Amino acid sequence: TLSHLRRTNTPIGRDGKLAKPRQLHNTHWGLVCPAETPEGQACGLVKNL
Amino acid sequence: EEGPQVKIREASKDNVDFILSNVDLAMANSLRRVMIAEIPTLAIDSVEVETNTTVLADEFIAHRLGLIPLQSMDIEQLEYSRDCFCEDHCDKCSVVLTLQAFGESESTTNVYSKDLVIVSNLMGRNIGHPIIQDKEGNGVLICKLRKGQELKLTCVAKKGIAKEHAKWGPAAAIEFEYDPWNKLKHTDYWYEQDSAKEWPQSKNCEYEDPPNEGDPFDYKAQADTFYMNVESVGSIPVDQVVVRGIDTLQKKVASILLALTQM
Amino acid sequence: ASRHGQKGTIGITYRREDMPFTAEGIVPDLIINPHAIPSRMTVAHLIECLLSKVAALSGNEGDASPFTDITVEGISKLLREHGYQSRGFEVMYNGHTGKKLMAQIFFGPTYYQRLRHMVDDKIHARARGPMQVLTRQPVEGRSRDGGLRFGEMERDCMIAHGAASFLKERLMEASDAFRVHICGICGLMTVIAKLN
Amino acid sequence: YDRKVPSPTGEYVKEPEWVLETDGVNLSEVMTVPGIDPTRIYTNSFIDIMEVLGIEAGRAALYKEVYNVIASDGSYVNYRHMALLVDVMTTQGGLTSVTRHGFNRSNTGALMRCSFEETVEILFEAGASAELDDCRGVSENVILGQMAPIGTGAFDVMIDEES
Amino acid sequence: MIVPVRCFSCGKVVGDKWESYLNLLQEDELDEGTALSRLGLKRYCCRRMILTHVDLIEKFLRYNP
Amino acid sequence: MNAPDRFELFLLGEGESKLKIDPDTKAPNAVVITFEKEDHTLGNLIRAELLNDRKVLFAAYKVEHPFFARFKLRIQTTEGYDPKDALKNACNSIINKLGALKTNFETEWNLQTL
Amino acid sequence: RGNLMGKRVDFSARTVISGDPNLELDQVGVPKSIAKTLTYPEVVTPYNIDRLTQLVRNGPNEHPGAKYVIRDSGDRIDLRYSKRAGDIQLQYGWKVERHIMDNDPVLFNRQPSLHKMSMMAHRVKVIPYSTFRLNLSVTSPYNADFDGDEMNLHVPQSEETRAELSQLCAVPLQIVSPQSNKPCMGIVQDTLCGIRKLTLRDTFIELDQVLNMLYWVPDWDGVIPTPAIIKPKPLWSGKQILSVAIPNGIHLQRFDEGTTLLSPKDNGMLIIDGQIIFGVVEKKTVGSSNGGLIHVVTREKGPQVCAKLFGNIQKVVNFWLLHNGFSTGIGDTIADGPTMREITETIAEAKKKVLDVTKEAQANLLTAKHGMTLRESFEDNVVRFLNEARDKAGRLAEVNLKDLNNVKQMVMAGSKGSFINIAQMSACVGQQSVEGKRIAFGFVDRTLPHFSKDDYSPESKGFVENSYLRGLTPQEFFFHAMGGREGLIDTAVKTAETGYIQRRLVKALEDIMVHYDNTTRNSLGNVIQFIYGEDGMDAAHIEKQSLDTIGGSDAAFEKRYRVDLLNTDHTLDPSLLESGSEILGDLKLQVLLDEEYKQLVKDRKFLREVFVDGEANWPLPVNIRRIIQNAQQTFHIDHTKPSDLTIKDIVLGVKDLQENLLVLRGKNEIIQNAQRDAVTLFCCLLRSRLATRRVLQEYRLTKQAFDWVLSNIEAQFLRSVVHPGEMVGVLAAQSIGEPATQMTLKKVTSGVPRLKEILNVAKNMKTPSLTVY
Amino acid sequence: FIVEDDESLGHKELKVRKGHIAKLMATEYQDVEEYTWSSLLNEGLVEYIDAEEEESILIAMQPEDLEPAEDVDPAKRIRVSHHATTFTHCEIHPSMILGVAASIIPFPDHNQSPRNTYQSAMGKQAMGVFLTNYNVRMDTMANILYYPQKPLGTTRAMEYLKFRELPAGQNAIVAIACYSGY
Amino acid sequence: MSNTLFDDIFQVSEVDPGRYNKVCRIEAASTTQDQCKLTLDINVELFPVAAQDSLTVTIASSLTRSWRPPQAGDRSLADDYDYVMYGTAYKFEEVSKDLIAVYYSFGGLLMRLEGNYRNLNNLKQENAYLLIRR
RNA sequence: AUCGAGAGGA
Ligand SMILES: Nc1nc2c(ncn2[C@H]2C[C@H](O)[C@@H](COP(=O)(O)OP(=O)(O)OP(=O)(O)O)O2)c(=O)[nH]1
Ligand SMILES: [Mg+2]
Ligand SMILES: [Zn+2]
Ligand SMILES: [Zn+2]
Numbered sequence A: 001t002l003s004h005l006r007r008t009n010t011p012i013g014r015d016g017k018l019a020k021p022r023q024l025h026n027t028h029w030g031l032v033c034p035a036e037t038p039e040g041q042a043c044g045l046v047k048n049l
Numbered sequence B: 001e002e003g004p005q006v007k008i009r010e011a012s013k014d015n016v017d018f019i020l021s022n023v024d025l026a027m028a029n030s031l032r033r034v035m036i037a038e039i040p041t042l043a044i045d046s047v048e049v050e051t052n053t054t055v056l057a058d059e060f061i062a063h064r065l066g067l068i069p070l071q072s073m074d075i076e077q078l079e080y081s082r083d084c085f086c087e088d089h090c091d092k093c094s095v096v097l098t099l100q101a102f103g104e105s106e107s108t109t110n111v112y113s114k115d116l117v118i119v120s121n122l123m124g125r126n127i128g129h130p131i132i133q134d135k136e137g138n139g140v141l142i143c144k145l146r147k148g149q150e151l152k153l154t155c156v157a158k159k160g161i162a163k164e165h166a167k168w169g170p171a172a173a174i175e176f177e178y179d180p181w182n183k184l185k186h187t188d189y190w191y192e193q194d195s196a197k198e199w200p201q202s203k204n205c206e207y208e209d210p211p212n213e214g215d216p217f218d219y220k221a222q223a224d225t226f227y228m229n230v231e232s233v234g235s236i237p238v239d240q241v242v243v244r245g246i247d248t249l250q251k252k253v254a255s256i257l258l259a260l261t262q263m
Numbered sequence C: 001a002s003r004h005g006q007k008g009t010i011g012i013t014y015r016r017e018d019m020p021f022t023a024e025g026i027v028p029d030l031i032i033n034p035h036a037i038p039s040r041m042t043v044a045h046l047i048e049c050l051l052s053k054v055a056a057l058s059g060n061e062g063d064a065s066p067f068t069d070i071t072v073e074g075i076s077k078l079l080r081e082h083g084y085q086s087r088g089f090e091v092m093y094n095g096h097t098g099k100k101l102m103a104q105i106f107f108g109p110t111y112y113q114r115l116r117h118m119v120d121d122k123i124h125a126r127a128r129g130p131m132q133v134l135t136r137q138p139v140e141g142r143s144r145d146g147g148l149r150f151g152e153m154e155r156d157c158m159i160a161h162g163a164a165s166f167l168k169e170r171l172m173e174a175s176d177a178f179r180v181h182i183c184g185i186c187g188l189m190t191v192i193a194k195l196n
Numbered sequence D: 001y002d003r004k005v006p007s008p009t010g011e012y013v014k015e016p017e018w019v020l021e022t023d024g025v026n027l028s029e030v031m032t033v034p035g036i037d038p039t040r041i042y043t044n045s046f047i048d049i050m051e052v053l054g055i056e057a058g059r060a061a062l063y064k065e066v067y068n069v070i071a072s073d074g075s076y077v078n079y080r081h082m083a084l085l086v087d088v089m090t091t092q093g094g095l096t097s098v099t100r101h102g103f104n105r106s107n108t109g110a111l112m113r114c115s116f117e118e119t120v121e122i123l124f125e126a127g128a129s130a131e132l133d134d135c136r137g138v139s140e141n142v143i144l145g146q147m148a149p150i151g152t153g154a155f156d157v158m159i160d161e162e163s
Numbered sequence E: 001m002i003v004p005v006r007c008f009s010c011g012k013v014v015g016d017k018w019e020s021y022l023n024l025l026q027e028d029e030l031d032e033g034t035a036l037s038r039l040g041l042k043r044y045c046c047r048r049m050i051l052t053h054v055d056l057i058e059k060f061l062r063y064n065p
Numbered sequence F: 001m002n003a004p005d006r007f008e009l010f011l012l013g014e015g016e017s018k019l020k021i022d023p024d025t026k027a028p029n030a031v032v033i034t035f036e037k038e039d040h041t042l043g044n045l046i047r048a049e050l051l052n053d054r055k056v057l058f059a060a061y062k063v064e065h066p067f068f069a070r071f072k073l074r075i076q077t078t079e080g081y082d083p084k085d086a087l088k089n090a091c092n093s094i095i096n097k098l099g100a101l102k103t104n105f106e107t108e109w110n111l112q113t114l
Numbered sequence G: 001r002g003n004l005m006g007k008r009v010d011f012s013a014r015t016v017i018s019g020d021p022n023l024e025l026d027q028v029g030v031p032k033s034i035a036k037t038l039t040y041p042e043v044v045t046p047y048n049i050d051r052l053t054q055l056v057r058n059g060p061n062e063h064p065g066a067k068y069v070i071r072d073s074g075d076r077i078d079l080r081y082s083k084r085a086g087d088i089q090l091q092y093g094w095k096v097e098r099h100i101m102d103n104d105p106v107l108f109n110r111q112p113s114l115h116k117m118s119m120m121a122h123r124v125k126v127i128p129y130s131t132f133r134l135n136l137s138v139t140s141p142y143n144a145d146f147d148g149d150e151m152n153l154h155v156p157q158s159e160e161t162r163a164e165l166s167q168l169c170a171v172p173l174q175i176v177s178p179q180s181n182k183p184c185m186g187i188v189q190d191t192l193c194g195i196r197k198l199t200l201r202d203t204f205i206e207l208d209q210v211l212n213m214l215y216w217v218p219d220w221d222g223v224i225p226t227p228a229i230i231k232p233k234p235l236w237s238g239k240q241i242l243s244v245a246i247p248n249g250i251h252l253q254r255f256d257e258g259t260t261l262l263s264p265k266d267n268g269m270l271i272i273d274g275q276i277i278f279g280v281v282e283k284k285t286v287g288s289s290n291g292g293l294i295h296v297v298t299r300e301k302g303p304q305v306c307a308k309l310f311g312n313i314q315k316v317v318n319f320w321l322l323h324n325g326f327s328t329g330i331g332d333t334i335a336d337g338p339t340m341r342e343i344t345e346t347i348a349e350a351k352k353k354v355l356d357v358t359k360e361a362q363a364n365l366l367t368a369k370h371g372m373t374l375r376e377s378f379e380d381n382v383v384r385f386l387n388e389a390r391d392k393a394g395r396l397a398e399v400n401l402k403d404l405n406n407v408k409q410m411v412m413a414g415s416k417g418s419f420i421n422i423a424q425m426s427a428c429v430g431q432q433s434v435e436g437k438r439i440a441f442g443f444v445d446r447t448l449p450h451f452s453k454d455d456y457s458p459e460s461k462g463f464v465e466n467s468y469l470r471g472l473t474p475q476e477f478f479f480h481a482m483g484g485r486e487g488l489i490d491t492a493v494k495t496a497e498t499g500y501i502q503r504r505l506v507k508a509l510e511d512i513m514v515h516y517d518n519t520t521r522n523s524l525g526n527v528i529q530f531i532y533g534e535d536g537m538d539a540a541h542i543e544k545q546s547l548d549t550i551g552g553s554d555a556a557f558e559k560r561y562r563v564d565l566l567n568t569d570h571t572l573d574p575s576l577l578e579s580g581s582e583i584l585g586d587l588k589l590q591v592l593l594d595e596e597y598k599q600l601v602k603d604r605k606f607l608r609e610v611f612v613d614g615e616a617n618w619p620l621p622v623n624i625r626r627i628i629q630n631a632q633q634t635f636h637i638d639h640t641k642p643s644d645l646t647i648k649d650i651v652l653g654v655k656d657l658q659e660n661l662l663v664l665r666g667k668n669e670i671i672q673n674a675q676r677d678a679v680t681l682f683c684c685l686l687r688s689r690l691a692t693r694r695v696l697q698e699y700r701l702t703k704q705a706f707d708w709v710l711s712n713i714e715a716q717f718l719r720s721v722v723h724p725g726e727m728v729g730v731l732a733a734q735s736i737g738e739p740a741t742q743m744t745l746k747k748v749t750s751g752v753p754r755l756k757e758i759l760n761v762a763k764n765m766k767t768p769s770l771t772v773y
Numbered sequence H: 001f002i003v004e005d006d007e008s009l010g011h012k013e014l015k016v017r018k019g020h021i022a023k024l025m026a027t028e029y030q031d032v033e034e035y036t037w038s039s040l041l042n043e044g045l046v047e048y049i050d051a052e053e054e055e056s057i058l059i060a061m062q063p064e065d066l067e068p069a070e071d072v073d074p075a076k077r078i079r080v081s082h083h084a085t086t087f088t089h090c091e092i093h094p095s096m097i098l099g100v101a102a103s104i105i106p107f108p109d110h111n112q113s114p115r116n117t118y119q120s121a122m123g124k125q126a127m128g129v130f131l132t133n134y135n136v137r138m139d140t141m142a143n144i145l146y147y148p149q150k151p152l153g154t155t156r157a158m159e160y161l162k163f164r165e166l167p168a169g170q171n172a173i174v175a176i177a178c179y180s181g182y
Numbered sequence I: 001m002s003n004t005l006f007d008d009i010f011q012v013s014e015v016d017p018g019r020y021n022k023v024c025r026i027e028a029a030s031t032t033q034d035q036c037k038l039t040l041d042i043n044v045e046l047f048p049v050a051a052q053d054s055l056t057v058t059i060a061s062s063l064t065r066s067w068r069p070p071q072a073g074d075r076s077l078a079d080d081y082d083y084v085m086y087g088t089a090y091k092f093e094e095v096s097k098d099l100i101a102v103y104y105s106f107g108g109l110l111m112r113l114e115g116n117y118r119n120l121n122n123l124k125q126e127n128a129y130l131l132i133r134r
Numbered sequence J: 001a002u003c004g005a006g007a008g009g010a
């Protein structure tokens, strides 16, 4: 129940080319969980805070 | 007598601790297993729920009743239900008991194993009573009722071996150790610097002599002398748990022998 | 599953007797394999278990909060005061035979979890059931007695084996297989086959 | 680079040699430089090797280059397997890739190349150009629910009247 | 959700001990380490049965009907 | 749901005997007995006793699979000794030792207090 | 693609799988529920009518029983309802769908199925409980685990399908895999780790234990083997009773490293008929290795004989281990007081070495390498400097691990775990990367906002100095998490990019199969290869065997092949040949030895020309070395008495054999030439090991035994040839396809990205490069 | 947390003092005075920082050990140093970087990363008391564990996670050992 | 039938526990014979062997079918010895000229014996025991 | 039973 109500969804992307959105970025420190994320389908696109 | 040799160390109503000299590891072991899970006892095996308005669910309670320890002193004169020629269960092969509990007060009504009442005819034998070792005089919490909560149950105990369900185990936990100093070298001790400084010396070292670095390895010696402590739940007293242990082993060894005759 | 990504099912269930046992007379509720350990480097699993033993004895809570000055060293110190040997080990006996196990064992409390998906929810079997309407094929889902997909990836395997007839039998005598009538001149399914 | 070469005496000894490594490729003009050995010069681009040194050199390059990715990763596959891949990529005269653009074009039966990527596009132009489907390919008999020319079907069985 | 009757791993009755457990902690003001030990619960298997025990029943009764 | 009821570990099914006897083909004077609804509790105790006897040449039991309660005991005796008798002797020994134990223990129990 | 290339089908099942060590390799534990659910149409014949009626009487609710009886008319008789379900009289020609019972052939896969080894026949054992039970050694061609994998099962419905399941897709028949000319199944985990333990020189098992083990092997001849020790206490050695499971006439030799037929460190292996002579048994021996025991016993004794081998080795080792036990503590990751102090000083010495190259680079006194940035020279240095430190740390930690250390013992056995694992657990986890470079500046000019700007030091850029036993720091933890997620990404991206490689591979090689003239065509009848594999042979049969014509001194080649009859120093001692004295001299014979040696010379030049690197070990049909050892132990030949062969029986014999090796059978110029070429290489090998000097001096063959050796070589050859029908198309696609899917990760592109270029035939490629000589 | 050099007595110190902590726990113990999160925020002791403003400040990981003043137990991990002068803010506690699921893994820092990911999937599929009124609601599927147990190893986070009061997992006795090979 | 095959007296020069706990490889020199050396694996737990000891090594080949336990004391048994093993002979190496060396394996524990006058004695045979005393 | 979407499993 908890961590469902704290989920974040990012969709996909555009026309130029590149930058890697699935990857955990430095700035996530303290705001978005490093560990918690679903494996496969939408790995790193979905996040918990 | 002639072979095996016992010496009780400490003994109380719930624990027996003893040395068991001059026997084969195989036997000492088999005495363990047959204590653990082959001496028959009595315990609730069918519950018929009539009204249950508690927070705990039906099958939940039923399960909790299974576990409740029942006095099984004269359990050998009670038959198994699978054997008895009746229909389902009788007074010859089962003990039937009733529980009734209702919310009386504001303070949460409690339901104990004390509140279970024998309803079948015992015929003078010491069976079926619910065992209480509680100082407060009522043992084992069954359920809790609130303002106006009602429980009304009918439990039929039956005869069973623990092999059929862990509820009919009369044994709890059974301590077992042989050759406290590694003198038979049956184990390779895991270490970092020093073996003996790192591993702790057991209660049972004061009854055997150290190995003395100077002596070579004894290879002809085998396993003898076994330190044990047999605990009991209270359905059979300690003394008998080991006795009946020895007896049931003896019985099913014999039935092998008597089935060579019939062949 | 433990609390460390270390996941696994029950292979068999032994009873207290067949089960290995310490001198005190404890049985394990649970035996996991040592091979699931060094490859996955879940050290914390061991740590928890060492912690968890000392909390069961001491009557205290085990503090497993990440960044702290809690160290396997100080846990062992605490344990050896309590009687058992510092690194989780305990000499056990083989329940079958009674003979002391040659190697000592790492034993101790560890919080385990039960997950959804149990076997009886999973098992499914079919032998001639309900078809689809449009395809005349077996129906997805075991919820209504369906049938498993012999996809192209499983087909490629019967090819590499060279089992042709079985490749047919699964794609005709099970699943589909219909009987149509073809005209000799034009190769179409026009024919109004007035049988009987 | 370390290189095993035959000693006068007969045995193999390790010769040290200096080899030069590039970044960018225009092979038509690098080999024709005086000073180098234009019999051993290699490229990781098998597409350039095909343009310069003929189809068959490219075929060994293309293998060298497939072999290289497998081997270096620890894994070991047997030569015939890779050689079958390479050889199929090479026998139509050019470098026929394993994608809808390459292999799914090569006058093969309509039904077959249907099982892959461009499904209905194939069918349309096969209706047009009136393509006859041979029915000797696996995929065609899978579709038709008939026994494929495959091991068991490679041949035929008949009774014969004695003996 | 209730004490276990009898600890999974040993067998020993632990059901009758909960009542006394809370008394030895609250009234007598003893630490849980001695509260497990006074109740005769010597091995850890039968100690984790009671210390780790969460008693939700009390909260389940809170619901009126 | 595919669980086989627990009684099948000690209760004997339909036309199953407690013992089955079989001559061994491979070694001369050897016999392989299949004990129904039994296990280590019993196998180990007999194979141990079938070893103290100096007229037995071979002694071993195994539970083929843990899922079923059964176990196979193979015995090999010296010429002029019947194996069925070695098992008979072996069994009696066991009962004797046990009868002693029981008596020695009761003697010791009665000499205690508390 | 969805309704035709693959249809949902009938007669199928699926449950969770679990492992079963007291089960046989080619079996499969179908649960009773499923058993009763699935079926097989069986026509009533006089042979089965009794055994079959029994079943119909049993009905559909009691296991060995049946549902449905089909009549002549074809009307179905539902035995769960019906009035006449305890009546029915079976006529000859009716069909009776019965439940599956023991030893039926079923097909059993695990998806994704990127192999032929992903689909295999098993004999059914029916069993209580809900899981499909399988053999712990058939784990790896399926790549399944018991953490919760689901597996599928299919049931044939024709007699002929039952056949073309158990003759072709049968598990034993799948053991030596074609992909990689070695077996694919081995011994694993407990049995692997336990076997090492048993084989140790110190491992001595005494009477009582030994008799149970003997009894445990079902193939045991009922004959107690004689104990290696009969002093005070008769003790058998580990190696002793394990050798009971190893069949007769199995030969194995290896030589690991420090191995001198004396084995000071118990290196290597030697198995002389059945018994094992020296060396610990491990992965290299009984794993799914190339020159191993499984590769031997398969080709030698048979599949069926080898499939029962797996059984035996497990029934014994699993037993032994059940009573020896084995474990893993935290204690096994703890390392010594001085070692921990020393591990830190190692780290501390590469810390200051990174700091000093930085200080040199900050002073602009940093010489830039040819063709790279000053900044790239710095990174390149600091990474390599910290990688050396993790490995000096780890190796340091591995030297300190005792022999009784549990972790080390699995690494030694080769059961699980490897060097990296030890370093990370006890010493330090080392540097953490994302996308090649070490952890980059996310925030402006700093990695986290706990550091200052422009801080290139080791700790700020994600060198995790700490071990897992010490624990990671807040900063450290997050950096690990970065590079962690990176691998989770590809395990979810790569995995599906690779499945797309396989479809593409598969759909284009599909119809490639060798026809009945070893030609290798497609659907059209277009030739792709003129002989398959350019050599005609099936890849399962082929194995790695050395060519001793290539290496060694010109003088060392002489002292080994050359027979000069007209030289008293270089003739064949009359001790070797029966007719030794009466050959010395001669004239007509020395033409044939100048004929033979002339060829061994024309071979040696040619092999050096083909294999210019000068590599001697190559895969090749028929293992000769093993045939020659099979002669000299079969015929019990003493190395003292002279051979009864003629110098003419050897030379002219080996040339007659050559003649009937036969890959292609055309009887005209063109095909005759291809027949010559298809064998060339094999013959260079034939001529090398079957040369007059060796046949007599090195391994002393007698006329009878020598003609046998020729007989075998021919038979074993002919058997190695590829069978027309073989769909090589799929075979190779899968063979490249699968190992690709196994890959999971100095400037060049390698791996999956690289392969994607190759197959796509990319014009715009990432790392082009010449290599000029 | 805020760090200002607001010290006559010396150096750069944390705005919050022990006196503040004592008032804060005077509000826990009385469950008069009334000191909450807002009273910290309003007094100016705590300060909401978003990711863009995080770009301009320098944070300290631990209060005590990252700014006191200017032997080693070998067992404790190797931590860097101070090596920064101008701390503007400090961290409330490093372990607060984790989500709800990862908060229940004991010693995540002593344990390899991607694994700590796995636990955070399975946690959500672990089974127990999901709400105390489970009897009363009518949900398609609810699984409730017979005998929940607050684990013997806890994380401080589980305090606020209410996990201690609503477990999903019993506390098995666990042997790691090669037994039967099952 | 049954006969002795070799007899000699050796003196121990080196003792080495090569990462083991129950086994040692032992190097012994021969008395009188200046062309003879011995290397052998010996179970030091059962029969301890120290440096600078003198041992007597025999080989024999008798005093095929299962093994038989006790009742051998009721039998005649060619053993006035302490340590006794059974083995296989595998290689027969030639250290130049007239100088031969034999190799045994007692289910794992190895033996290497060097000399010359044992040419018509130690055959290429499945048998071969080993006896050490005092 | 048909479509579309989401969550998980290996
Ligand atoms: N013996 C051996 N096993 C390996 C090797 N490489 C990987 N493995 C095993 C360990 C892993 O369990 C598996 C591959 O990675 P996984 O992502 O499956 O790891 P994990 O241990 O989490 O297993 P799981 O994800 O639960 O299937 O195969 C190897 O080189 N040798
Ligand atoms: Mg898996
Ligand atoms: Zn009755
Ligand atoms: Zn028409």
Ligand SMILES: [Zn+2]
Residues within 6 Å of the ligand: E007, E008, E009, E010, E011, E012, E044, E045, E046, E047, E049
């Ligand atoms: Zn307990």
